[PDB]
Amino acid sequence: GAMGSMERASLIQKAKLAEQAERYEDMAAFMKGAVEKGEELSCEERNLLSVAYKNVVGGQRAAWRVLSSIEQKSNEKGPEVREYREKVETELQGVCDTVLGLLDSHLIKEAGDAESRVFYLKMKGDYYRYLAEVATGDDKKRIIDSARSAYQEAMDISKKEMPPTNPIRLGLALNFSVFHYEIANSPEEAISLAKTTFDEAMADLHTLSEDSYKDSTLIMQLLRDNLTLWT
């Protein structure tokens, strides 16, 4: 890798600089290099990794949806719309494969604490979900089941090892509920998960400090936003 010659600490410092400069492709490349040093990541470092790739793949997803919509409408202008949608789609799949590769080599297998293991398994579910969004082949069902399996393992650990207000647990439930709603075609499961997650967090808020309260209620509001659109 092109980051092989840079110090781990320098890569993390530059990832933070890149974030400030809104240079998310750089940020992702720096964090990939930091992961490939082979040491486990701290909480802050995990979040730098996730923020970086979330921004990169987010730009690709938005572009893919624009092109897919133009393509659907067009279905004569020639092969160009399909070709360019395919180009963006292939780049998106490449980013997802890169993230999944980092998780599989070897972030997940070395993650023993709930906070790290749930975080990485949630990411694995997320990037299989982004692959599922563009999947149309004979692999779509297996991609969907890979997302489900990762989310489910993360859910099982989070329910056993974290309080219901834990922001990682909450964000996992949020994303798994969206997976149910529009990837798995299970809107009822999505609504049930979102409701139970919200209600169990509400009952646990009394245990929290003012700062933790703020962190938890922020994600609870996202659950409520979805419930409002779904019901």
């Binding site: 990169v56 987010g58 730009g59 996992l172 949020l174 969206v178 996202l222």
Partner: peptide
């Protein structure tokens, strides 16, 4: 497409 809320940066 109507996009629902998910965790982290709303980057798309």
């Amino acid at each position: 497409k109507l996009m629902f809320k998910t965790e982290g940066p709303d980057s798309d």
